[PDB]
Design a protein around this ligand. Structure first.
Ligand SMILES: NC(=O)c1ccc[n+]([C@@H]2O[C@H](COP(=O)([O-])OP(=O)(O)OC[C@H]3O[C@@H](n4cnc5c(N)ncnc54)[C@H](OP(=O)(O)O)[C@@H]3O)[C@@H](O)[C@H]2O)c1
Ligand SMILES: NC(=O)c1ccc[n+]([C@@H]2O[C@H](COP(=O)([O-])OP(=O)(O)OC[C@H]3O[C@@H](n4cnc5c(N)ncnc54)[C@H](OP(=O)(O)O)[C@@H]3O)[C@@H](O)[C@H]2O)c1
Ligand SMILES: NC(=O)c1ccc[n+]([C@@H]2O[C@H](COP(=O)([O-])OP(=O)(O)OC[C@H]3O[C@@H](n4cnc5c(N)ncnc54)[C@H](OP(=O)(O)O)[C@@H]3O)[C@@H](O)[C@H]2O)c1
Lengths: 313, 312, 315, 303, 316, 300
């Protein structure tokens, strides 16, 4: 679907943006535009990929004119620019509002003005039953995206969103913490052995975005079905992959869709599709055993490498 | 404490603003300013109170210059301007952000610039564990109020907030609607019989706002303790008072089954101050508070004049 | 001409907006959008009409983005959002400028951007020979609308306006004040018995807007011809309909800022206006008042009063 | 009253601003700031006056920040920046609103923020019974000025206004047209000989602004009493002064409305309209002799 | 190329705008819109040309809505609105930025929204190697114009620029000063006799704009090749044409902030420039200045001066 | 002059900002506020320094309200927020204008409104005889800083600036490239052997800012005198140390050099030629002593 087309990714210097580049840079796509504020991160990527298809635009989604110019001639937009950290959003909620909410309004308005064909907005499980300023701002962003998706019937723009939770082995998460502790001979620090988390990789997320991109109608929100595991099972599976069963250990659920969303949702195989108008959480989804957890971990390249005595990040 | 002071109420044409006028207009306060957008409502209100202490300002809290201008020479502000209806905010969430969040940032910034001494912001229980755009926007508003309340260490401005739920015998609430349905001989329309609500009056909310006004520290949020009841117990108690011993519809979209005034997180830091909790800046809900039975519910209803009028 | 079309009324929760719904809602129009600021009023309207064709948009004409979003996919706009009260505007003239003038520029620019086919702007007789801030701002609005309409030759947007004065039995006007005073046994309070007003119903106003809507060219202002009456003759006609011919009347005296006649077209306008039967058309450049129009006697005034259901019920 | 004070004139490059400069530059005022958009006019003016007391600010009254910055440390403001031509305003009424109404709002807000002591706003007779966009916009400007002047009780700022009509020997006005037509041997172009205009000089206008400046209270509008003449009387007196007798050849201006006249204070040479009919037809009529004596106040005519 | 078309000139009340009007007003062009802030200058022009083709718009290029509105139905735009005086920009550099940079951005965005076919932006030699706030701001404008000229591939708008220095017999310049001083028998005031300037008439500038208008691709900057001369040679050629070969000259000294040459293309630009006959074309990605271009001798300088109607008149 | 004061650094997450913290965090200063846009960098710094004196503000200098808010209660500001990369500014000159010029206008205007006492602005040698969008934008910023510094006589705010070039062993500079190229076994990639650069460390840069902070008058720009070296002498001295045996920058224009005050180790350009070819040239021995000021170099 990307042949001779132009894709723009807001927040493209982030982990998502990189995942998308690695998949698409050497395909038949014409151009990938990276839109973000930071010139150092953009320079590093330029050198890392050394690809003529990769165009970099300095800009801020808070700035309508900026995004309006970057989206001239663009076919598709992946909207991933956000403030995503909990403490900074707690202390500067206006900043979260300006970026996540007003920023989102700008990209969509620019997309509509420039006749962009498709826009996918990335959202988080923290938006379902939100408890802090970051989560709240993402919940508000969804509401905004859905309202904006109305009246585009004559026009040729489809806007929809995807929602996913934390991905395995992202920065400062449990898996790289456990791996380090095992490498350093330290006991694993475990809060609650029975705390459950959804388990999905960064590749799975890219697939979720690709699915929404192909199948979405205005205002749709897609969620990918994901299995879950307890921290107990995660630690056990990891000690077995790294050959340290005889290794010391020292001693609550996330939701992807609310009850309300569940009653209206379409089950579409590996995805739920929530059309615009029990909970689905890590406790009641498919539970992984150690063997199934080991298969998921082995989808991480740094972990495959460890079982060979190789070390990469 | 209001003697010869100037009070400005944003959203002053609403039910809150009226309750505040009825209490304070004929006391020793120098001036009450009503700041809102609607010329019709202001005109009606002006005729109703016909008081020289009552000054009217047309303006929108979305307009910084406008609120900056009206708060020149003001000592205290009750910030009550909001979009508060659920369906309206769901279909227009940007309007809720512009009014509830950005509008609040404007009022607070104007207050700081004009050396206003105290501001109390009104919030709702729907901001706790919010599930709809209205509640989400109010939750965001609380965070902004709190964040703005820091760095005022040099300045002589105090900002705090209050949070309360639905009041009994309000314009479009359950009690006058049930009475109205009976007057028309129709069965009572109930969404969820097992739904609990805090039972509280407009008078109590004014007390709550006055309480925060006297005692608040920067970033404080006050909540008033109240008993609760199911709509079932409420409907039953009202039928007994009216001597006429129901249609169950469904739980409506974006409507919880209980109201929450403090989250689990807040409950941990909150100070219990007798009839109020005080949440300082940086679980308590209608399900686990004092539950009223038909007898307890009746003794409350008989304190409401709108009900007294009907039993007499 | 409205079949399967989308109409948006800015200021749609007002009396004009309601008259338009009562006429068009149950016709073959596709959708009517109401655009205004107050959620309370919109909610009442929604319950009142209970129609799937009626869509509500919260927004302010001061906000370009807001009206730009509400007019996407719209065919026609009736622009009726205004601040119209005289005392309120004298103390806050910037608010009048912001809503009446800048708000009008916003709706028109949005209309041009969303390729809306026709926009009719509602104006008032107070724009003719204006003496106060409300009136001054409405005069400026007409000029802004007219200037905006001289830019559209490449585009498929037509912009024009209508001008009319108060409608009979509007809120806080003379007729319901008299009816009330009669019901409560009080003498009728009259300021100046010889004061004349144009006599015109709310249905007549909808017809005027429809006329402009059908026949308007860029920058036109349309005015509907109407008879007038003194308050004396109005009071007499009403007392007879209510069978209270000998009911006292109190001559209070002339109010601050209340004229004795209204003008619908100025002398300068009459020189250029085209007589088109029941309407005048003032073309854009690129005296007609209540004293000298057709004067009604009591019998004529009674036939007009009987057009109001509010009065019919009383007989 | 200007001793060691700072005066800012918006629209200072105009004919009024130059009249004020000619008057005040060589007094004990500390500084006169000229605030306007045109670098050309400001440069010529700098060269013409070659004075260290004369400071120039490029800026637009539509730009709040610009005027906020230019008025830091200013004691007094004469607000004279406006769009004034009638045809220009009919075709671009938004520019008139932006400059005359919103621009004025900015100057007053800037003056209030910077604690400027006095602001006098210049207005026109075309604002009384306005019939066109230029006049309507000036009428709006007065209402805005008056409304802003309420709430200054805590503050030490006084805002008021002046209103006057066309001045004699201004550019493209009646006198230089008649002078030019005689120079070119052409007959005098008269629309209506029986139409009356107030007769007043540029120096008189400067006096009017100084009067309001000294005596004004919040929201006051001052008007200067002036005699009037028919264009007929004007042509004759002018033909006689130039020794070219027997040479081939609204309808009045109003300075106070009926409503204002009821509330106005007669203060000798001035009316003072306090915040809440006088026209050229019914004011003192000049005959040919009185017109000649006025025309001789123009040095331009003496030659 | 102007038949039945609509042309808009920002800054149309200035000297360039007049030269374009004198040239095109009485041709088959449909309409010329003059867009500027000053009602006085516009009224003067209106009377001067008395042409039904000449339409006036009040507005500021700093105001996006104003220019958006003025360019509806416009085919071509000559963008000549600027703040161009050196002292003025030094004390208010923000005003230079607001008008020259943000104003240019507004005009270009308006042109794109209204589907204007071509825009030519006028720039100055002071943008090459800029040393003061006026020049610095004009350099920024070119960068902004070039950057905006990208991504218009789908759209049917072309944006390009021209750069030129002072033209002969413009206001407050050397020639009308010398001509006046001669008529009053006063000696000619010369700062630095060896200072070289490019020699180029107002008509040449119009041709340069017309050329850029016909030939430009997005982001192009055109420069017209021009010979140069010293003030010494300028004074001598003029003294001979006016028949005052024996006319006193006062050497004041080199003036503050006045260079001895102007540059039209930098070394870096010359490396990338295309030679197109009478013009250089710098595409969007030796120094070329008045010292190293063709020197005019007195005789060749006479032939240039004789192109001015103002000078031809005096030899009669 | 820092005792119990509040310092705010715009762009505080940069290499300069980190240098200032390393120096001042554990002194008797009351508070250091870091104002920048990036939550990731701010978080890492919070973790790295773990100090209660270090406050973080998310904000953009393009946003007047944001900077107005973070400067409430601030005594001194180091304005170091900029876009400084050349290609990036060539393709996006409006972003350079918005951040470097309008952003600077916002900081000073907020500084004035909140009665900040002293503001020092950081500028670059590329503002002298500028040739590309980044440099042009910085030159404009100086003009804006200087113009803003007039009219402050009544107010208790002083604004001034500093200008310096690339510092030794900065990211993507000549030195770490040479070290890395030996590390990857390739001979060193040299553009022009004869090209001169001023030779200066990050610590010297902090001193320059401290100097301006102590001595600045309204509209002043300070430059620190520094020696220079050929790329040859730079390359040669390092190869001896490592045991493996345009073309100049300008700091003051001819125009500035005429009015500049010589103040010992600094030039002070008051409001209204000095380059790397004609400054003190280091030989291999002098270059050796300078390279040894880098801990990055000492360690090897
Ligand atoms: N593990 C996950 O990846 C995860 C989990 C749950 C939800 N999500 C959601 O998926 C989205 C993508 O997440 P991510 O992991 O890729 O986050 P990320 O790594 O932090 O990337 C965010 C990027 O957004 C850019 N950005 C921030 N503010 C901007 C602005 N005002 N204008 C333009 N660009 C701006 C930043 O680039 P610059 O600093 O260069 O400007 C930043 O690199 C997020 O919105 C997130 O809520 C992700
Ligand atoms: N059950 C309850 O009533 C309840 C419960 C908990 C908390 N609260 C909170 O108490 C506050 C007010 O209570 P309420 O019952 O009196 O609400 P209300 O009756 O709806 O009155 C709100 C007022 O705000 C004004 N307003 C809305 N938008 C504005 C704007 N953009 N600028 C200026 N004024 C604006 C409206 O007046 P105009 O239309 O004239 O502009 C309206 O009169 C609300 O913030 C609400 O969240 C209410
Ligand atoms: N060799 C040199 O690098 C050199 C030499 C002389 C002078 N200077 C000047 O000194 C400063 C550079 O210092 P530096 O190199 O140590 O830091 P830096 O690495 O260049 O980073 C500067 C910081 O500015 C922040 N920033 C960028 N745009 C911003 C904005 N719009 N609002 C708020 N913050 C913003 C960035 O932080 P976030 O991404 O977190 O927002 C960035 O970390 C610049 O002014 C530079 O021109 C540099």
């Amino acid at each position: 679907m990307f042949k001779d087309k132009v894709l723009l990714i807001t927040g493209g210097t982030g982990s998502f943006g990189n995942a998308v580049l690695k998949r698409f840079l050497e395909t038949d796509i014409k151009e990938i535009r990276i839109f973000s504020r930071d010139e150092k991160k953009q320079d590093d990527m330029r050198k890392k990929y050394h690809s003529a298809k990769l165009k970099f635009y300095i800009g801020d989604v808070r700035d309508y004119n900026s995004i309006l110019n970057a989206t001239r001639g663009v076919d598709y937009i992946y909207h991933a620019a956000a403030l995503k950290q909990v403490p900074s959003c707690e202390f500067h909620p206006m900043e979260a509002v300006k970026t996540n909410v007003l920023g989102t309004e700008n990209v969509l308005e620019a997309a509509i003005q420039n006749h962009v064909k498709r826009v996918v907005c990335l959202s988080t499980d923290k938006a379902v039953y939100p408890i802090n300023a970051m989560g709240i701002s993402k919940a508000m962003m969804e509401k905004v995206m859905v309202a904006k998706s109305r009246n585009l019937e004559g026009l040729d723009t489809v806007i929809c969103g995807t929602r996913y939770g934390n991905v395995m082995a992202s920065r400062g998460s449990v898996i790289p913490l456990f791996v380090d502790q095992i490498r350093q001979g330290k006991p694993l620090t475990i809060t609650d052995p029975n705390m459950t988390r959804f388990m999905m990789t960064l590749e799975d997320a890219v697939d979720l975005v690709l699915y929404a991109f192909e199948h979405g109608e205005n205002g749709d929100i897609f969620v990918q079905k994901a299995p879950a595991a307890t921290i107990a099972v995660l630690a056990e599976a990891l000690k077995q992959l790294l050959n340290v069963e005889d290794h010391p250990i020292s001693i609550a659920f996330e939701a992807l869709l609310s009850r309300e969303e569940m009653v209206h949702a379409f089950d579409q195989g590996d995805y739920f599709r929530v059309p615009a108008d029990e909970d689905y959480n890590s406790h009641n989804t498919t539970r992984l055993d150690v063997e199934g957890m080991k298969q998921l971990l082995l989808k991480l390249d740094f972990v495959r490498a460890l079982t060979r005595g190789e070390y990469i990040s």
